[PDB]
Amino acid sequence: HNCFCIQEVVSGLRQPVGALHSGDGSQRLFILEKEGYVKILTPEGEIFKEPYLDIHKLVQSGIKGGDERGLLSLAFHPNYKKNGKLYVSYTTNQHDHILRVVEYTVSRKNPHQVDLRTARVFLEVAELHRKHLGGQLLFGPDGFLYIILGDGMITLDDMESDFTGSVLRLDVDTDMCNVPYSIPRSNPHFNSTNQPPEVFAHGLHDPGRCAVDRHININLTILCSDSNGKARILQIIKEFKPFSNGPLVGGFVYRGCQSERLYGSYVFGDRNGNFLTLQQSPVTKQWQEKPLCLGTSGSCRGYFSGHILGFGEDELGEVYILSSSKSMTQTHNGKLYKIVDPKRPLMPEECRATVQPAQTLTSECSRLCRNGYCTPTGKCCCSPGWEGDFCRTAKCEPACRHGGVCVRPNKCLCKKGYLGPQCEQVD
Amino acid sequence: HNCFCIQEVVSGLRQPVGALHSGDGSQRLFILEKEGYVKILTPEGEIFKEPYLDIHKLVQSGIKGGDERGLLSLAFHPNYKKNGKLYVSYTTNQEPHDHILRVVEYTVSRKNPHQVDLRTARVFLEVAELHRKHLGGQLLFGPDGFLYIILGDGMITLDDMEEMDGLSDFTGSVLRLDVDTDMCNVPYSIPRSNPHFNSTNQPPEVFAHGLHDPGRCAVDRHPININLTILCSDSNGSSARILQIIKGKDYESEPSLLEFKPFSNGPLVGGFVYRGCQSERLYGSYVFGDRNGNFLTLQQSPVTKQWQEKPLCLGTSGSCRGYFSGHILGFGEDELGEVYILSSSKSMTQTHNGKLYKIVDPKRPLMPEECRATVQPAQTLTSECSRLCRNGYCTPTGKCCCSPGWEGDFCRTAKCEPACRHGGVCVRPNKCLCKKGYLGPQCEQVD
Amino acid sequence: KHNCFCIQEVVSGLRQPVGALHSGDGSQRLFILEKEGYVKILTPEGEIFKEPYLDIHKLVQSGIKGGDERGLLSLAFHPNYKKNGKLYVSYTTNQDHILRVVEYTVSRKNPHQVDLRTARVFLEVAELHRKHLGGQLLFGPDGFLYIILGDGMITLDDMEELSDFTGSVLRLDVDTDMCNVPYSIPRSNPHQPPEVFAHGLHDPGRCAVDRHPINLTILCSDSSARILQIIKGKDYESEPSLLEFKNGPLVGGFVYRGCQSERLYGSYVFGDRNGNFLTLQQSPVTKQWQEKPLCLGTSGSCRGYFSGHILGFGEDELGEVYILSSSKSMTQTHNGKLYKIVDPKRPLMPEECRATVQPAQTLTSECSRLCRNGYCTPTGKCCCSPGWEGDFCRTAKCEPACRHGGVCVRPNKCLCKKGYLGPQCEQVD
Ligand SMILES: O=C(O)[C@@H]1O[C@@H](O[C@H]2[C@H](O)[C@@H](COS(=O)(=O)O)O[C@H](O[C@H]3[C@H](O)[C@@H](OS(=O)(=O)O)[C@H](O[C@H]4[C@H](O)[C@@H](NS(=O)(=O)O)[C@@H](O[C@H]5[C@H](O)[C@@H](OS(=O)(=O)O)[C@H](O[C@H]6[C@H](O)[C@@H](NS(=O)(=O)O)[C@@H](O[C@H]7[C@H](O)[C@@H](OS(=O)(=O)O)[C@H](O[C@H]8[C@H](O)[C@@H](NS(=O)(=O)O)[C@@H](O)O[C@@H]8COS(=O)(=O)O)O[C@H]7C(=O)O)O[C@@H]6COS(=O)(=O)O)O[C@H]5C(=O)O)O[C@@H]4COS(=O)(=O)O)O[C@H]3C(=O)O)[C@@H]2NS(=O)(=O)O)[C@H](OS(=O)(=O)O)[C@@H](O)[C@@H]1O
């Protein structure tokens, strides 16, 4: 057989929706739980007791299976190793609910938990329903943040926002302390003032997890599965197939090292673990499906528990399955499964990488900027009432007098003998 | 009424940390900048363009407020007018540890009395440091002629010591070295009066220990039947305490000479003993002050011999004002004995506008008849050592210590080992200039 | 150099300071004059108020070239300013140009700002050139206003006309009740136009004015150096200096009547552009004038020099004197400085020189409180605007008069009784 196999890595999870790495060399795997938690899995296989991110109070999650509200996606800044920037999309309530896209920053004190005080709202998408929400975040090799939103089943209500069913592309590397993101010049509606500049492409309804090929001859490829009504696949570069009888969870482009034959393949799978591969003809540019099969080889088995909720990718490129059921949710037993090529060793010699354990932030901005926030580029944006280079000097208007010092905004520390808000009074 | 006043002398300084004179009669004031500069203020009120000392590349200085790294202290040898010797303590990181607190000896340029010859650096001590607070390192000479070094505890915990990675037996102690030595191996010798000079357990340099985060210490010279008095402010952990320094005491287990809750604007920056001339009433008094210019006087009860704090007030009299800009960073004393405060703020640092302020007694003239002194302008080095000793270094006493490969009274003759042969001349150490007919590194072979 | 004085910097960041003075209201404020047309307040604690005391830089024509004397020239506070808030200002404007002397009044709402609407033009002297302008304002111990004007004109220019006032010392009485003319002529004036008290000056520096003398004394410098004593009805053309001395010509002078310096009391001090000072003192024995040099020397922080060139002098309410300096370099950098003269032989605050600040109060006179449709004379009489009459000008005047019992509410506006129409209620309905 040419089949692959599924190996259980961890269990005891709650409604896992995805997993990914930070690209800092630490080979940590960050697991997303719908209720609003992000947990760390170390390379030795331990789950840290303290969540990396706990926002379950902010997050509105649904009870019933099929309620898509919750924590949707996470993307680490391409330069997270130096600036500790990460991005999160979740649902909350204030007009049913509102889909947020927020930036967070890792604690300068602890590289394994996020400083919750560093939240910055980037986008707030008004939502009217609880399905077709999308919410995937990813960075392209251009360095830009892509946001993939469903349509939220809005149509006649649209006549009465404007971001649903589109792929947004923001530039998070801005110096303007006014706006959290700037629009890249390449966007199709930059400075048009008729369509939103953030919109890069539209027309999505209920997209699954999109496969992201990163490859020279082409910069970036995003393939999405989509099921408006009972499936179709869509390409964004720099209707694609008549397959039937499926509802696809999503897909990935395998760039791992354990499987030689799977390299470069687009893999898609449905709720029940039926996997297919997509192959484009370089000659005819037409897409074709071949099933990918699972079979048991010792410990790694040709099956897994429950239903697929999302996919994972570690820093070495190996891909994962995240599963749960209605039985596994109340029992608090979601699982993380690795996809293995049983034809190949578990650690082929060429696939070894040395763990570089995660270090605290070393950048000049995080170290000295305290009365404001740090942009991903490093500019320290001061809070109101501060103006230093790192916002360390307070502003007092009117100025402190009789030698007073402006210690905090509009607060004068007077010398003995001088009173009043600006030390203007004598005796 | 009975207040003092504060007079601005110069501005445009960069994070000044202290000021002092060289005792050579020139009435120059040397101002210390944290980033690693020493500037000269002439008696006529001029700041020289060229710094007296520029070691800002050597110096590791800190950005954060509360980051104490930088140029810490300076002390002129008691005989600087004759030998041009000065001592400097700064933090650097060029040699495990966080940074290293060095105490170095420099010597004024023999061509220019207003610049120090940077090539004459001699490292005396290198104290490994682990943190960036409680590390203050004040340098001063007592009337014994010895160099006192006052080091904080560098916030080094007891478990840090159990590894003894960087020896740092010196933190939290007062070191006392004898710099007037002739041994060219060691830079300083230990005075026999030291309490541990033979003890193989305690360090011989340690004169007293038990300090944590001491401010600038007041140095009375009695210029009261005792030879030496040194008072330091100290923060045991907030409830500021003041300490008298006497041979071989441990100030975790020694009574603090006074304890008073702070004024809440800041802990005590430090203090001085006023031996100036402009103010009659202030003579002999111990003054201490906090970050915000709250000044105290220490007065002993003749009845109980107990010390007590008494406040001093500031008030405006024309140009002389009862306030000043920013926060106190350090103190100053000129050659006539008048005391100064150096101030800066967060706003004054980026503007590069630290200031030097003179403390004035407005009840007295600015130049009372008796306080007049004649300026003796600084002269270049005339000592026999600086003039003739060229292949080595000069000890503060005058002995010329040769570099490896040199000998002579003033190290003027090179050494060749093995010696040059057949009339050859030893021109540089281990280089023979042979006469024609004789070859080889020592002219040993005959042709 | 045992007897020198010293210079202590008080404030900087000024722009072309030309003088400083106090208001004699007990507040110990020091009012600094900036050439471009500003007057700034320096508090005794050494602060400069953000808002100027007087901002007339739009009205003022000031000069660019070094040696162009146009700008704000002088300021003098009325001797009773604490009660009536009257001040006088001399500046140049061009509507070559015209040297104006105007009266202002401190805002009834704010004692630290001048009500710009209370201007009263007293004199308008036509000028033809930009040098030799003088224009010093001062009140003598007689209570009269003295105005000291230079002359930048030539005889050919006189015939082509305009100013009967240039090169004279005018003496006006500002304490008048006549609402027609802003000033009346004192009977003692030698009555040249009646305003002239003495004439014949050319290019005078700042004149010293002694108080606490039995006599009246005003000394002026004039262009080795020439100094003049001013007396009623005197022609100073071709008149010798009091003494011969001798280096720049003299900027001006003052009489030290301060308290910090014992030895300097009663002396006249003069200085040139570069800080070379001389002193004139009358001998108590023979009443004769005598010259003594005054030197500057460093005493610790107090220094025997200063930056740039002297532009004018200052005097605070306690009588201590000041130097105002700038250079061609300090003007572009916008860094003029105010320097205090100190006697280092004496304490900075001698026991006997202490005075308590009486902070400035809003106007309390009956006139400023009740006179609303006119202006207040320094005496207290309320002078009505056209179309108003009465003790406090509170009753409007209607011409022709209102008829049929109508009430004259606003000037030439009748409030008619029911049954009567028209601008004077002349028509019956
Ligand atoms: O403000 C205030 O005040 C408020 O507050 C609050 O409140 C709330 C709360 O909260 C909640 C809770 O909470 S807690 O606390 O408790 O936690 O509650 C509430 O609410 C909620 C609830 O729930 C309710 O209400 S009440 O009142 O009632 O209670 C509601 O709910 C709802 C929902 O919402 C809806 N949805 S939507 O979307 O529309 O909106 C619905 O649901 C439905 C649907 O359908 C679904 O869902 S989802 O999610 O998905 O969307 C589900 O479904 C299901 C079904 O039904 C079933 N069936 S049965 O019959 O069994 O029943 C199943 O399935 C099935 C079927 O049939 C199929 O399927 S399908 O898809 O098609 O449908 C299939 O078929 C099959 C067959 O069957 C066979 N045959 S036989 O015969 O044998 O059977 C064969 O043929 O085979 C086939 C196959 O086929 S295929 O497909 O495969 O080809 O299958 C079957 C089976 O069985 O298997 O199942 C499903 C699933 O399930 S689950 O579990 O997931 O669910 O569901 C449904 C139902 O209905 O159930 O509806 C619901 C109900 O409604 S009513 O009417 O009732 O109203 O609402 C909710 C909400 O959310 O709200 C409360 N309220 S109150 O007022 O009451 O108080 C809140 O807040 S928070 O914070 O919480 O948020 C709010 O409200 C406010 O704020």
Author numbering:
A (entry chain B): 214 to 307, 315 to 380, 386 to 440, 444 to 458, 463 to 470, 482 to 670
B (entry chain A): 214 to 308, 314 to 441, 444 to 457, 461 to 670
C (entry chain C): 213 to 307, 316 to 381, 385 to 414, 420 to 441, 446 to 455, 462 to 484, 488 to 670
Task: Quote the original article.
Hedgehog-Interacting Protein (HHIP), the only reported secreted inhibitor of Sonic Hedgehog (SHH) signalling, binds directly to SHH with high nanomolar affinity, sequestering SHH. The C-terminal domain of HHIP is composed of a β-propeller and two EGF repeats (HHIP-C). Our data suggest a multimodal mechanism, in which HHIP can bind two specific sites on the SHH morphogen, alongside multiple GAG interactions, to inhibit SHH signalling.
To structurally characterise HHIP-C:GAG interactions, we determined the 2.7 Å resolution crystal structure of HHIP-C in complex with a 30-mer heparin molecule. HHIP-C comprises an N-terminal 6-bladed β-propeller and 2 C-terminal EGF repeats, previously identified in the complex of HHIP-C with HhN ligands. The heparin chain contacts two separate clusters of HHIP surface residues (GAG ‘site1’ and GAG ‘site 2’) at either end of the molecule. In this arrangement, a HHIP-C anti-parallel dimer coordinates one single heparin chain by using a central positively-charged region formed by residues from both HHIP protomers. A total of 8 monosaccharides are resolved in the structure, running from a reducing (O1; sugar I) to a non-reducing end (O4; sugar VIII) and forming hydrogen bonds with several polar side chains. We also determined the crystal structure of a HHIP-C:SOS complex, which exhibits the equivalent anti-parallel, dimeric HHIP arrangement bound to two SOS molecules coordinated at the same site compared to heparin. We observe two HHIP oligomerisation interfaces - an anti-parallel ‘head-to-tail’ heparin-bound HHIP-C dimer with a total buried surface area of 603 Å2, and a ‘head-to-head’ dimer with a buried surface area of 981 Å2 in the crystal.
